[PDB]
Structure 1
Amino acid sequence: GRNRGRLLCMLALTFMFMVLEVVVSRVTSSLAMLSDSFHMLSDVLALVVALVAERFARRTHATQKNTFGWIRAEVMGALVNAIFLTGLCFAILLEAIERFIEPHEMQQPLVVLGVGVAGLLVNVLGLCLFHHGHSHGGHGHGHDRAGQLNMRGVFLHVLGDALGSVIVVVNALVFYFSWKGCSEGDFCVNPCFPDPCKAYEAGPCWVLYLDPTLCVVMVCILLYTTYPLLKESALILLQTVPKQIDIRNLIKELRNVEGVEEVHELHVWQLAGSRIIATAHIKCEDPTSYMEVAKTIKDVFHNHGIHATTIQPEF
């Protein structure tokens, strides 16, 4: 409820800021603003993926197209958001390099500054806002993490953009305060800026390379903060034993338990969130005591937290 509401609100606000950019470009007769319209198309794509994902994670029930259900869909949503952000980070880095090798000068600094401040406000609002395993429930004795991962994915995109907004605002301010370049055409020369199109002193060209370098630094930050989630997400999709559980201790402890000849094929794997699933085979001697033995076996897995289990007797 709350999560879907937050995502829908941000998607709606994102469309509103898209319309604001388009109309501002229309009044100003500029096209790079329209280019900013498309970054907005990309934030809208992250938000829509995070959401298919919330509806779907909710169908936590035993369908027959998935005997397990869909919570893993939410983890995958987090994963794909992370991968999308990493791809956008690489494309941003390659644009930063392309602007380092080819400096780019912009026009109408005031409207750029205004749209950048508005985007900074929107992104700060988003960052403040976004701050059948038979497991989550039931003691589990028998005869929520995914939400955090999905929101951290959306939070990283919003942070990414926010850093983009900070870079645009700072660059526009530095241009307006410290760049005195010439465009009138009378006593006009651009020594630093190459490519002064076709055939006083211009502004300090060092400032223009202020834009690339910070962007590069920016992506590093994002990549750093992106790395744990895509690690965590790709391990929720690798059937790796969760870090809290160690298998060597489990094997020796199980065998310690009475009546148990062995264990073989112990697979412990983590479902989406805290729904760790473990299946085992346990050799015994007397099948009748097997049941009490199996309850002891359930007690072990249990101490270790694995409260969903299937342990074949293999007499």
Structure 2
Amino acid sequence: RLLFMLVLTVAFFVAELVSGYLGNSIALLSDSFNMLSDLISLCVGLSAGYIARRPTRGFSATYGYARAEVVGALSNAVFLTALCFTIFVEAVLRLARPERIDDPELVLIVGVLGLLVNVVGLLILHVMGDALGSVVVVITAIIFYVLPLKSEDPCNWQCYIDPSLTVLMVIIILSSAFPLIKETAAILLQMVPKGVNMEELMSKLSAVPGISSVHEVHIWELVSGKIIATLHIKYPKDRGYQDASTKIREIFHHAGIHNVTIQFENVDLLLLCNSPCISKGCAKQLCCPP
């Protein structure tokens, strides 16, 4: 992997952040915020790589720190959403009170260099967002460069180009952050992964021969590819559960789930959980209360 992306990205985030206030460009500020999200993503990726190749799986994190990638992805998406909210609010203000670019040359140089940085990053919608933001910065600087606006003269149409394009790229960036927010939240909400079709899976689980009932089916995803399926199963007392275990495990394997914990409970009250918490008062803090 490449780690020089982190130092370059943080230095360039600082550069765009300084030049955006120095040049009075929201598009440069929006691109600086987008590269801030990019460097947060790089830090999250390095954290995931460090968690891998050196697992801990101790007494504090039972599953491990694999969920760090998803938590960091959701946090980065929410961070970028708040930054885009601030950028959109500022752009709406400048759509009412327009402002000039103080140093069009500085903004042009920083935007061109940011476009080059994003190009080399892609070389080594979500991905094209940074490139389009740098293109927007370059266009805004060029308009103030090819057709200069005198300081004494009031704001012409040129002052509205930056807020409009910045609003457009706020929309573009949000159109990528929102699906990411939805996916990472769905993973973190302990929801069934999109690949797993639960209806057919429960149909097959019920169709498994020699099994009385199936309850407390809890299928959730730790990370991409790690699907955990907790499951309680009621079986006739006289018969065993070795064949049932094999069939349920192969069904889950064919459904893409390899982490299957089956609790077998001996057998209209014969459908409830035979092994809840040892007290009747535990029914409050029991998922799927009986």
The TM-score with structure 2 as length reference comes to 0.78
Secondary structure of the 1:64 match is coil
Distance in 2 of aligned mates of 1:15 and 1:34 = 20
Q: Post-superposition shift, 1:16? A: 4.8
Structure 1 residues 169, 264: CA separation in 2 closer, same or farther (over 3 Å shift)?
Answer: same
CA deviations on 1:274-297 (whole Å, 9 max, x unpaired) are 111112122222455321222122
Structure 1 residues 93, 224: CA separation in 2 closer, same or farther (over 3 Å shift)?
Answer: same
Tell me, yes or no, if the aligned pair for 1:268 and 1:279 is still in contact at 8 Å.
Answer: yes
Secondary structure of the 1:214 match is helix
Q: Superposition pairs for residues 119-268 of structure 1, below 5 Å?
A: 119-129=114-124, 156=126, 159-179=128-148, 181-183=149-151, 190=153, 192-193=154-155, 205-268=156-219
Secondary structure of the 1:263 match is strand
Tell me, yes or no, if the aligned pair for 1:59 and 1:69 is still in contact at 8 Å.
Answer: no
Secondary structure of the 1:267 match is strand
Structure 1 residues 272, 60: CA separation in 2 closer, same or farther (over 3 Å shift)?
Answer: farther
Q: Post-superposition shift, 1:64? A: 1.3
Distance in 2 of aligned mates of 1:268 and 1:15 = 39
For the aligned residues, what is the CA RMSD?
Answer: 3.0
Structure 1 residues 109, 261: CA separation in 2 closer, same or farther (over 3 Å shift)?
Answer: same
Structure 1 residues 265, 209: CA separation in 2 closer, same or farther (over 3 Å shift)?
Answer: same
CA deviations on 1:35-89 (whole Å, 9 max, x unpaired) are 9799379354554344334323554442111111111011111111111111111
Secondary structure of the 1:124 match is helix
Tell me, yes or no, if the aligned pair for 2:24 and 2:100 is still in contact at 8 Å.
Answer: no
Structure 1 residues 45, 272: CA separation in 2 closer, same or farther (over 3 Å shift)?
Answer: closer
Query: Which residue of structure 2 lines up, in the alignment, with residue 107 of structure 1?
Result: 102
Distance in 1 of aligned mates of 2:12 and 2:182 = 33
Q: Post-superposition shift, 1:260? A: 0.4
Structure 1 residues 310, 45: CA separation in 2 closer, same or farther (over 3 Å shift)?
Answer: closer
Query: Which residue of structure 2 lines up, in the alignment, with residue 198 of structure 1?
Result: none
Secondary structure of the 1:67 match is coil
Secondary structure of the 2:231 match is strand
Q: How many residues align?
A: 261
Q: Post-superposition shift, 1:218? A: 1.0
Tell me, yes or no, if the aligned pair for 1:277 and 1:309 is still in contact at 8 Å.
Answer: yes
CA deviations on 1:163-197 (whole Å, 9 max, x unpaired) are 33222210111111123x334xxxxx53x43xxxx
Structure 1 residues 209, 279: CA separation in 2 closer, same or farther (over 3 Å shift)?
Answer: same
Tell me, yes or no, if the aligned pair for 1:268 and 1:278 is still in contact at 8 Å.
Answer: yes
CA deviations on 1:191-250 (whole Å, 9 max, x unpaired) are x43xxxxxxxxxxx1122111111111111111122221111111101111122122222
Structure 1: gaps of 5 or more residues? 130-154, 184-188, 194-204
Secondary structure of the 2:140 match is helix
Which portions of structure 1, spanning 4 or more consecutive aligned residues, are displaced by more than 6 angstroms? 18-22, 34-38
Q: Post-superposition shift, 1:159? A: 4.6
Q: Post-superposition shift, 1:258? A: 1.2
Tell me, yes or no, if the aligned pair for 1:266 and 1:280 is still in contact at 8 Å.
Answer: yes
Query: Which residue of structure 1 lines up, in the alignment, with residue 233 of structure 2?
Result: 282
Structure 1 residues 62, 110: CA separation in 2 closer, same or farther (over 3 Å shift)?
Answer: closer
The TM-score with structure 1 as length reference comes to 0.73
Distance in 1 of aligned mates of 2:92 and 2:224 = 39
Tell me, yes or no, if the aligned pair for 1:57 and 1:74 is still in contact at 8 Å.
Answer: no
Structure 1 residues 302, 14: CA separation in 2 closer, same or farther (over 3 Å shift)?
Answer: closer
Distance in 1 of aligned mates of 2:36 and 2:15 = 16
- Corresponding letter in the other structure for 1:213: S
Distance in 1 of aligned mates of 2:24 and 2:102 = 14
Structure 2: gaps of 5 or more residues? 267-290
Structure 1 residues 117, 295: CA separation in 2 closer, same or farther (over 3 Å shift)?
Answer: same
Structure 1 residues 34, 212: CA separation in 2 closer, same or farther (over 3 Å shift)?
Answer: closer
